[PDB]
Amino acid sequence: ATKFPKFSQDLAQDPTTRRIWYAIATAHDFESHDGMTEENLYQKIFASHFGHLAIIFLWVSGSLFHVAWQGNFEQWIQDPLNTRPIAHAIWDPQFGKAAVDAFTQAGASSPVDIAYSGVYHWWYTIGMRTNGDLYQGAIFLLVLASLALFAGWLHLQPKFRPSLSWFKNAESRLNHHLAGLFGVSSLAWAGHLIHVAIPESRGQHVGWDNFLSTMPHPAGLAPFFTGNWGVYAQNPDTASHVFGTSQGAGSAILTFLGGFHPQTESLWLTDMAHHHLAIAVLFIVAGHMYRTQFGIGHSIKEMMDAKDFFGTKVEGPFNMPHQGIYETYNNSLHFQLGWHLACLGVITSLVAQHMYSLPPYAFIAQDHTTMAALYTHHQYIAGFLMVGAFAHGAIFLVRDYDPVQNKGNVLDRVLQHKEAIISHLSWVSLFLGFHTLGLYVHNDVVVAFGTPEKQILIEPVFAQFIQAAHGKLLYGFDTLLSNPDSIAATAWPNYGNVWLPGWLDAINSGNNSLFLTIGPGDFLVHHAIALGLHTTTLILVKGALDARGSKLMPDKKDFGYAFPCDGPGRGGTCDISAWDAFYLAMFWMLNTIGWVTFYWHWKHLGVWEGNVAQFNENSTYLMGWLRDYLWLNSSQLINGYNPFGTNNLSVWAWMFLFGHLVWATGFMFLISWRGYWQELIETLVWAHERTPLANLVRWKDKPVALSIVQARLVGLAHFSVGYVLTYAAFLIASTASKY
Amino acid sequence: TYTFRTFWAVLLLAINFLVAAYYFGIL
Amino acid sequence: CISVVIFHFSWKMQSDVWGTVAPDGTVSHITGGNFAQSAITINGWLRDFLWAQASQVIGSYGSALSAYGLLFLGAHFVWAFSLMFLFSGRGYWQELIESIVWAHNKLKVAPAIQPRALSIIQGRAVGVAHYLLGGIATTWAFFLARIISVG
Amino acid sequence: AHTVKIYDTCIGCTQCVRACPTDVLEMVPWDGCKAGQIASSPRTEDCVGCKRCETACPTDFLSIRVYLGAETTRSMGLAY
Amino acid sequence: MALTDTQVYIALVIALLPAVLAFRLSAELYK
Amino acid sequence: TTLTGQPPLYGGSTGGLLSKADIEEKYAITWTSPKEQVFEMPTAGAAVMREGENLVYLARKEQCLALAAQQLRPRKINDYKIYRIFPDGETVLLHPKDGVFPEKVNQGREAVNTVPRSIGQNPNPAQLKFSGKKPYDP
Amino acid sequence: VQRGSKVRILRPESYWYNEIGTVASVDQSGIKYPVIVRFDKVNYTGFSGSAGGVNTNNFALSEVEEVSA
Amino acid sequence: DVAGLVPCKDSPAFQKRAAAAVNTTADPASGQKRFERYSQALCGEDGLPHLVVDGRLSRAGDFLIPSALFLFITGWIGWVGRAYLIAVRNSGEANEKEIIIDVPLAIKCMLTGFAWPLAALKELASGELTAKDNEITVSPR
Numbered sequence A: 001a002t003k004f005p006k007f008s009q010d011l012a013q014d015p016t017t018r019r020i021w022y023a024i025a026t027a028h029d030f031e032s033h034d035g036m037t038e039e040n041l042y043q044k045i046f047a048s049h050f051g052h053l054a055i056i057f058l059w060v061s062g063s064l065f066h067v068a069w070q071g072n073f074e075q076w077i078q079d080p081l082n083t084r085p086i087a088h089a090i091w092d093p094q095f096g097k098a099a100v101d102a103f104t105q106a107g108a109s110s111p112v113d114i115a116y117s118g119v120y121h122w123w124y125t126i127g128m129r130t131n132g133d134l135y136q137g138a139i140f141l142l143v144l145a146s147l148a149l150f151a152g153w154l155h156l157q158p159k160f161r162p163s164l165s166w167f168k169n170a171e172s173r174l175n176h177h178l179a180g181l182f183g184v185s186s187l188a189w190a191g192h193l194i195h196v197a198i199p200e201s202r203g204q205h206v207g208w209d210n211f212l213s214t215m216p217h218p219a220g221l222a223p224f225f226t227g228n229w230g231v232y233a234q235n236p237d238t239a240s241h242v243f244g245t246s247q248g249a250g251s252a253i254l255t256f257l258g259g260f261h262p263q264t265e266s267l268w269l270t271d272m273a274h275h276h277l278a279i280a281v282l283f284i285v286a287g288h289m290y291r292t293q294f295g296i297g298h299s300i301k302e303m304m305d306a307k308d309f310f311g312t313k314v315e316g317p318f319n320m321p322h323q324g325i326y327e328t329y330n331n332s333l334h335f336q337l338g339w340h341l342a343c344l345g346v347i348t349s350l351v352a353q354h355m356y357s358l359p360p361y362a363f364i365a366q367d368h369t370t371m372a373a374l375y376t377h378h379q380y381i382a383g384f385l386m387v388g389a390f391a392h393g394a395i396f397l398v399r400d401y402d403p404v405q406n407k408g409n410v411l412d413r414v415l416q417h418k419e420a421i422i423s424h425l426s427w428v429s430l431f432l433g434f435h436t437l438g439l440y441v442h443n444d445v446v447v448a449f450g451t452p453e454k455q456i457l458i459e460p461v462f463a464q465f466i467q468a469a470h471g472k473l474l475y476g477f478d479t480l481l482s483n484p485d486s487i488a489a490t491a492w493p494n495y496g497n498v499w500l501p502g503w504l505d506a507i508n509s510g511n512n513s514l515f516l517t518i519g520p521g522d523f524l525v526h527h528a529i530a531l532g533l534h535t536t537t538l539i540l541v542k543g544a545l546d547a548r549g550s551k552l553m554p555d556k557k558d559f560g561y562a563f564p565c566d567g568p569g570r571g572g573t574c575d576i577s578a579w580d581a582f583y584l585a586m587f588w589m590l591n592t593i594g595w596v597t598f599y600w601h602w603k604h605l606g607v608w609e610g611n612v613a614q615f616n617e618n619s620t621y622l623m624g625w626l627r628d629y630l631w632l633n634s635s636q637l638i639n640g641y642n643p644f645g646t647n648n649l650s651v652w653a654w655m656f657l658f659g660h661l662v663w664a665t666g667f668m669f670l671i672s673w674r675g676y677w678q679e680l681i682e683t684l685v686w687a688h689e690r691t692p693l694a695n696l697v698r699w700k701d702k703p704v705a706l707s708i709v710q711a712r713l714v715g716l717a718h719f720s721v722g723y724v725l726t727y728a729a730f731l732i733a734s735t736a737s738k739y
Numbered sequence B: 001t002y003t004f005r006t007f008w009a010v011l012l013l014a015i016n017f018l019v020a021a022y023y024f025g026i027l
Numbered sequence C: 001c002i003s004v005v006i007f008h009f010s011w012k013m014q015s016d017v018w019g020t021v022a023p024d025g026t027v028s029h030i031t032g033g034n035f036a037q038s039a040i041t042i043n044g045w046l047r048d049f050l051w052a053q054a055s056q057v058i059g060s061y062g063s064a065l066s067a068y069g070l071l072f073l074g075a076h077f078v079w080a081f082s083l084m085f086l087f088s089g090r091g092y093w094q095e096l097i098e099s100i101v102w103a104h105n106k107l108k109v110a111p112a113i114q115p116r117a118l119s120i121i122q123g124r125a126v127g128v129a130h131y132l133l134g135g136i137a138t139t140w141a142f143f144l145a146r147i148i149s150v151g
Numbered sequence D: 001a002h003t004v005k006i007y008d009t010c011i012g013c014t015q016c017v018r019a020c021p022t023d024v025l026e027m028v029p030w031d032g033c034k035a036g037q038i039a040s041s042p043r044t045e046d047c048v049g050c051k052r053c054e055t056a057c058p059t060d061f062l063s064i065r066v067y068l069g070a071e072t073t074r075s076m077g078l079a080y
Numbered sequence E: 001m002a003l004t005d006t007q008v009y010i011a012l013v014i015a016l017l018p019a020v021l022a023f024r025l026s027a028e029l030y031k
Numbered sequence F: 001t002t003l004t005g006q007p008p009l010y011g012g013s014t015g016g017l018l019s020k021a022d023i024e025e026k027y028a029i030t031w032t033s034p035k036e037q038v039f040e041m042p043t044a045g046a047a048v049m050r051e052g053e054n055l056v057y058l059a060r061k062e063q064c065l066a067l068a069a070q071q072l073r074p075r076k077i078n079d080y081k082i083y084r085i086f087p088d089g090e091t092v093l094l095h096p097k098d099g100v101f102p103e104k105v106n107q108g109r110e111a112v113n114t115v116p117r118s119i120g121q122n123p124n125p126a127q128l129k130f131s132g133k134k135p136y137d138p
Numbered sequence G: 001v002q003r004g005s006k007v008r009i010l011r012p013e014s015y016w017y018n019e020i021g022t023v024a025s026v027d028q029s030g031i032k033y034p035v036i037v038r039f040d041k042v043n044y045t046g047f048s049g050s051a052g053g054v055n056t057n058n059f060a061l062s063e064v065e066e067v068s069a
Numbered sequence H: 001d002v003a004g005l006v007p008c009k010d011s012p013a014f015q016k017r018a019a020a021a022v023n024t025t026a027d028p029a030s031g032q033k034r035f036e037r038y039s040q041a042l043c044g045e046d047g048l049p050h051l052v053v054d055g056r057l058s059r060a061g062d063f064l065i066p067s068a069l070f071l072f073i074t075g076w077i078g079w080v081g082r083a084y085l086i087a088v089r090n091s092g093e094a095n096e097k098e099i100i101i102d103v104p105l106a107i108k109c110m111l112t113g114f115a116w117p118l119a120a121l122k123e124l125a126s127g128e129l130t131a132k133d134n135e136i137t138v139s140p141r
């Protein structure tokens, strides 16, 4: 045997190379390790969380330090529309002189990378103005990572290891996260915005050296111990305000103007501080809800077990049986993980959908490439998180679901009618797919034969009506908030809209991306998204719900989450496992997010260049997507290096080709399967053992082919890496060669 | 006898038809 | 193998052999001798052969050559359809057909001949048939439209 | 080693023993079926995990069950 | 202004401490 | 042990034994043929069965059993014996242990790994959490 | 039960759960699963690519419910 | 008129591309009649006959009459198929019948699809439409 892996003796007595590979893939599956108890399990979870927190802090520290050290932060401060932000310096000894000249950009003397995270805009919006502020933030995050590392180490010391009853205290955690994390952290951020970010927006330096001696409001802390709150909102920052300077500077610190700052092109900072105040107060109230140890409070378990509505029968909350769902939630870490990843994926996607249309940062809507990168990044993260949510739901259903403790409740009735669930998911998937592919191919065929008038073009009149209901008078609906006389517009009893002038100018001045104009191309694409979401959901739900057992395999719970198959018997059982359904749905999620990001990017290129007719006339067939979006915009990307020389796009051309290579390399692992490679490695073993001067050196682990699940994972990882790198290369180069 | 579920579905249908009346200019 | 051979053939003829002769007797090659300097990098193959020469098959709509653009797209579709059969296994498909059978059983419409997923070998064969048809037909439509519009 | 478990729905048709490529299973006396024999696995250290026995099993669901576990040289089928 | 050589060196020396804390957390998680 | 039998007339092949035969374990199939005949070796190629006792060393038990099943049994040879041989020279009889082939029920054979329930009566992994207990334990 | 009696299966692991099949024999001896039930929907059982399955299986009397006589 | 849409008549782009009508069929006119028919539609910025799927009984011919046509034909198809499947399950040669269609019975169940929806209503009334949940197979959980 070998020492490695310590956590699994089954892999430790393995004499093959597989012992290494599986160990790397089972190092974080703590429950399946040898000698695992629930106590030590949960404590390891806690310390790994602290370690991850420290990694996050080190990462932000690195970004801040490289911008402060090798970036052009202050040069970008003085001219944020015409200066490229520098990520970090390049040190590649293999560069020729042409690549040194080509990467000497953004006012630098050396080769540098252009930052496309938008971190410059977010740091400029939050009051950071010199290199010293960023350097201080970098060292402070270096301190915070150290504190997180020490806390993770401490909570595994014998005296400081938290008890299992502490970990299972959902009431206390909910209260302290809603009011402490979610509430007090938002209160503190409103405090930062009011105390620092708004003064630096108005030209004033409120550093750590004078914040105790600088009042936020000219007669401040008097109006809000008296109910005179409106004094903090009397003179808002003027529409002639120049950001970072006192020219036209107002003095309000909490407004509800609505719409955008006109020069900075983002939302108002005072409006953000007021939002954060409202959110903090609401979240402290929400965290004042559950019964921890002071008698007052709610308890979730009693609500889940409640069957009494003031004398009525009620099966439970909403007359739906809910017994043991508290126990199911709190005892299964995989249920918790699946739920929390679903919530996280939803809000990450909401972040993506809200930042492009409500830009929150100074002049970030003018940095088109960073906006593209941020939308695409957060949508891909959201897709990955949703797939992980459903994967851990499946893992919970194979490893933690007790039908006895869930006998009767909502989860049991879902498991009752899982076939109707999966079948109607199949129906809506086929529905959407058949019709969207059909309308697209009809448009393609009639445009091909020189007849674009025969295109089935369907206006998104429901979403256009919603846009009108937000205030866009372009469509001519004359409905709520686009009629000045609707009771929604005037708010008849209180007359307290006040957001509405700013928002109405925002919605009815096309210079932004707030509720962009949509047409039949947008209809067809949104149905492609609907198809993609439904089919990825279908794969993941069929995997999770039919993971405990199938009609083909009615003992699938006993084989675990990941297993290759049940063999070629019973008709053939390739990819029967619940891991394999995750593996299938990852491709579908990648395709769906590629669709959403293609849509976003082509529409925004048409909007930024002003040629919106390009999208509104060519996105209805699918050669428009190939010619006017994929073939065209790659043109500068692919000339990143040519026989005539190297541009600064040589990185993105090289990474474009590299992503194509990784993506195609994955196809090898996904298409060719194991026994071929095992038979080939057998001949290689024979050749090595019968070669003179080579038989003197022998392997310590016997060479075997990759396992079935392993190479499924390897091909999926290669496919995903190639997918992501290829699209990131195309996005950055097609959006950075112009704007 | 389907009373609870019918009430909730009828409520949701009523919200749908209220938005439809907004759409068609009746409201 | 055969795709790379026909790519080499197409680019070598279009760059160093095929073209027009002037009255004075000067050969103006179709792609102007880019092969000696572009075909040594994968970027050059992607740019000056695959990106550049596909302009004809993608601008082909509305003319005598629109059907080649249609089959270019349709063959891309069939090739990507292949990867469903190639990357997946029949356990999933049998399990999903099972719930669709439940739906059919509910409305008294499940057929006498039991629906089954395709076998492992059959799934592999369908994947390879679609892959070959899609890739070959994409190259065929590309070749035909490009060398008819330009040659 | 892989784990081969025989469940009492066995009808003793001997089809799993006849299909084992590595001589893992054998027929032993048992009064629980009409055939008078149950399959058994004294030699699961020689099990490669091919699941030919489950393919050969005619009971629904299977009386023989192969659970792939820790891999050794014998269970990996390495001739080297 | 710009970062000085001393600020960069101080950053290296300060980041030496999370290195030891990371090593301690890794060795304690290994046990 | 001391395995008797003439080697079959085989020209050798690159598919035979490797280092594992000499340092870990190897296998030998001994049978008796009534006549000089032809059989396909599991390490590919034809070989000539000598009349009398034939002895073949293979690298895996499964190769010996494939030799017995596809070559000896259809040639009416059912007296073969498969042994495992260790590097020190120790020989252990393996395939027809109690003299009766495993697919014939033999009195005196005991049942190993027989579970007295069905597949459906197996427990749930959720009840069968942190413990040595697995869903297939008797 | 008795031979020829249509019966419903209450065995969850069975392919024919909640479905009817004719009883072809009840074993008089004291075995755990005496009832032979012959269905018309064949099984999954067989190698991959094989066009068929089994239509005959064995069940206990507590895993079989006589709907008809 | 809805959602900023205009009729194709007062659409300049529409008349511009109608001045260059291609010929889809072997008609000498072809494109002229196509365009004079498409003129009644609601065109747009591109001068193309956009469709509204809204009920909107004036512009009901863009979805609703084709919707009814499709639903009637496809429900005819489905009811004919269901009737045939129900009627061959009676014979023990059903598996032979699914590959070798019993053509007189096929036409018999074909010709009664003209009353496809009403009959299904009676089935929805009767209970001879949906199978009970205890008569259909299901996997464990």
Ligand code: CLA
Pocket (backbone or CB within 6 Å): A089, A090, A091, A092, A093, A094, A099, A103, A112, A113, A650, A651, A654
């Ligand atoms: C032969 C091809 C080649 C090679 C070897 C490199 C190498 C490098 N390039 Mg590069 N580059 C190339 C081609 C190449 N380039 C081309 C053709 C272009 C376009 C002209 C560029 C343009 C370019 C730019 C703009 C930059 C570089 C940079 C770099 C340096 C990265 C420094 C670093 O952080 O390492 C660390 C590597 C990683 C963090 C990634 C490794 C992740 C792997 C996949 C997984 C590892 C995880 C695993 C658990 C580790 C195992 C254990 C391990 C600790 C042993 C590196 C020396 C950067 C630089 O100069 O930095 C100072 C820089 O910004 N290059």
Ligand code: CLA
Pocket (backbone or CB within 6 Å): A045, A046, A049, A050, A053, A166, A167, A169, A170, A172, A173, A176, A177, A179, A180, A181, A182, A185
């Ligand atoms: C006031 C008390 C308090 C506070 C502040 C926390 C805070 C925290 N706990 Mg804790 N906890 C507490 C009391 C508290 N706890 C008590 C009393 C118990 C006993 C029941 C627990 C038991 C407990 C356990 C078992 C765990 C935690 C964990 C955590 C961490 C959550 C993960 C994380 O870092 O992301 C922080 C998330 C946010 C800051 C916000 C979440 C999402 C918001 C709503 C979206 C808005 C973001 C905003 C737009 C940001 C703009 C982005 C831009 C600036 C870049 C977090 C720091 C976990 C951990 O990581 O361990 C170290 C975990 O293991 N807690």
Ligand code: CLA
Pocket (backbone or CB within 6 Å): A024, A025, A026, A027, A028, A029, A030, A337, A341, A384, A385, A386, A387, A388, A389, A391, A395, A561, A562, A579, A582, A717, A721
């Ligand atoms: C909150 C986030 C979170 C957490 C804490 C977990 C935690 C866990 N997951 Mg999970 N998961 C998540 C999100 C999360 N997951 C998401 C978002 C997905 C979708 C992808 C998944 C899908 C998933 C599956 C299918 C499984 C798990 C499993 C597990 C468990 C064991 C992990 C393990 O050891 O395998 C570790 C895995 C690795 C070490 C391989 C990592 C692959 C590398 C990092 C890819 C990088 C590519 C390359 C290096 C990039 C190079 C770029 C360069 C070339 C340019 C563990 C409890 C496993 C389990 O135990 O099932 C019962 C299981 O099978 N997860």
Ligand code: CLA
Pocket (backbone or CB within 6 Å): A426, A429, A430, A431, A432, A433, A434, A437, A531, A535, A538, A539, A584, A585, A587, A588, C077, C080, C081, C082, C083, C084, C085, C087, C088, C092, C096
């Ligand atoms: C372009 C490639 C492609 C296409 C078209 C599909 C299509 C489909 N996938 Mg998919 N998939 C793919 C790649 C693809 N996949 C890849 C690479 C993976 C990872 C391995 C997956 C993994 C996957 C899973 C796990 C699942 C699917 C499912 C589906 C089906 C859902 C039905 C639907 O939404 O749309 C409608 C159907 C179409 C758009 C295709 C039909 C096209 C025409 C109308 C059919 C007739 C052809 C034409 C007349 C020619 C006749 C042929 C003959 C004359 C020669 C559908 C057929 C899901 C499913 O089956 O739902 C129940 C399912 O769960 N896929």
Ligand code: CLA
Pocket (backbone or CB within 6 Å): A017, A020, A681, A684, A685, A686, A688, A697, A698, A699, A700, A701, A703, A704, A705, A706
């Ligand atoms: C299934 C995948 C697999 C895996 C995970 C391993 C893993 C391992 N093998 Mg193995 N092997 C395999 C398949 C595999 N092998 C196959 C199919 C064969 C043929 C039968 C072998 C034959 C084999 C032998 C003979 C040996 C190993 C050994 C090893 C171990 C050391 C790795 C090594 O030698 O790197 C070798 C490095 C390379 C292959 C890279 C090529 C190096 C080129 C020539 C130049 C690159 C050098 C360059 C300067 C790099 C810059 C370094 C930079 C960081 C400064 C390692 C755990 C050794 C061992 O077990 O130690 C006791 C050993 O002796 N293997």
Ligand code: CLA
Pocket (backbone or CB within 6 Å): A423, A424, A426, A427, A430, C099, C100, C101, C103, C104, C107, C109, H078, H079, H080, H081, H082, H084, H085, H101, H106, H109, H110
């Ligand atoms: C009589 C034939 C018949 C009937 C009444 C149904 C009815 C139904 N099917 Mg099914 N189906 C059929 C044939 C049929 N199907 C065939 C031949 C296939 C293999 C291609 C399928 C594959 C299929 C899938 C994957 C799904 C359904 C689903 C459904 C249900 C939802 C409607 C739907 O999705 O439409 C779509 C149906 C198709 C796209 C199949 C094509 C239509 C065929 C060609 C009609 C068959 C007619 C037959 C050949 C000739 C009969 C005439 C006779 C006189 C000779 C519904 C009850 C869904 C479900 O699960 O319930 C919600 C669903 O996911 N079906």
Ligand SMILES: CC1=C(/C=C/C(C)=C/C=C/C(C)=C/C=C/C=C(C)/C=C/C=C(C)/C=C/C2=C(C)CCCC2(C)C)C(C)(C)CCC1
Pocket (backbone or CB within 6 Å): A334, A335, A336, A338, A339, A342, A346, A389, A390, A391, A392, A393, A394, A396, A397, A541, A544
């Ligand atoms: C597998 C599984 C699982 C998982 C699951 C998941 C993963 C999920 C999800 C899910 C999701 C992902 C969800 C969601 C949601 C959302 C919603 C439900 C919403 C909404 C909405 C609304 C309601 C809104 C409204 C409104 C509007 C319209 C706008 C304006 C304002 C207002 C508010 C009015 C678990 C773990 C459990 C276990 C079991 C199995």
Ligand SMILES: CC1=C(/C=C/C(C)=C/C=C/C(C)=C\C=C\C=C(C)\C=C\C=C(C)\C=C\C2=C(C)CCCC2(C)C)C(C)(C)CCC1
Pocket (backbone or CB within 6 Å): C107, C109, H053, H054, H055, H063, H074, H075, H077, H078, H079, H082, H120
């Ligand atoms: C107004 C309108 C609309 C809407 C619509 C909707 C929204 C709907 C719905 C609906 C629903 C919500 C539904 C439902 C359902 C349920 C069920 C349950 C069903 C069914 C079915 C069946 C049962 C069938 C049967 C059959 C027949 C009858 C024949 C053939 C065969 C079969 C079997 C298939 C739109 C705008 C679009 C357009 C315009 C008009």
Ligand SMILES: CC1=C(C/C=C(\C)CCC[C@H](C)CCC[C@H](C)CCCC(C)C)C(=O)c2ccccc2C1=O
Pocket (backbone or CB within 6 Å): A024, A668, A669, A670, A672, A673, A674, A675, A677, A678, A704, A705, A706, A707, A708, A711, A712
């Ligand atoms: C190519 C291929 C192989 C052969 C690949 C093998 C044997 C892996 C050899 C990889 C060598 C060791 C180089 C790997 C280099 C990696 C980049 C290093 C990563 C190591 C991590 C631990 C960091 C299989 O074994 C296989 C098995 C099952 C289905 C499909 C396939 C398959 O397609």
Ligand SMILES: CC1=C(C/C=C(\C)CCC[C@H](C)CCC[C@H](C)CCCC(C)C)C(=O)c2ccccc2C1=O
Pocket (backbone or CB within 6 Å): C084, C085, C086, C088, C089, C090, C093, C094, C116, C117, C118, C119, C120, C122, C123, C124
């Ligand atoms: C999609 C897919 C399936 C499902 C594919 C199936 C079920 C093929 C059959 C589909 C067609 C639609 C069957 C047609 C049924 C009737 C003959 C239709 C009547 C035809 C008239 C309309 C003329 C598998 O079975 C499979 C198996 C192994 C690996 C991968 C896959 C795989 O990817």
Ligand code: SF4
Pocket (backbone or CB within 6 Å): D004, D019, D020, D021, D022, D023, D024, D025, D046, D047, D048, D049, D050, D051, D052, D053, D054, D066
């Ligand atoms: S899995 Fe293969 S080696 Fe193991 S008992 Fe079954 S047939 Fe024999």
Ligand code: SF4
Pocket (backbone or CB within 6 Å): D006, D009, D010, D011, D012, D013, D014, D015, D016, D017, D038, D039, D053, D056, D057, D058, D059, D062, D063, D064
């Ligand atoms: S094949 Fe199945 S039923 Fe037959 S003896 Fe083996 S385990 Fe028993």
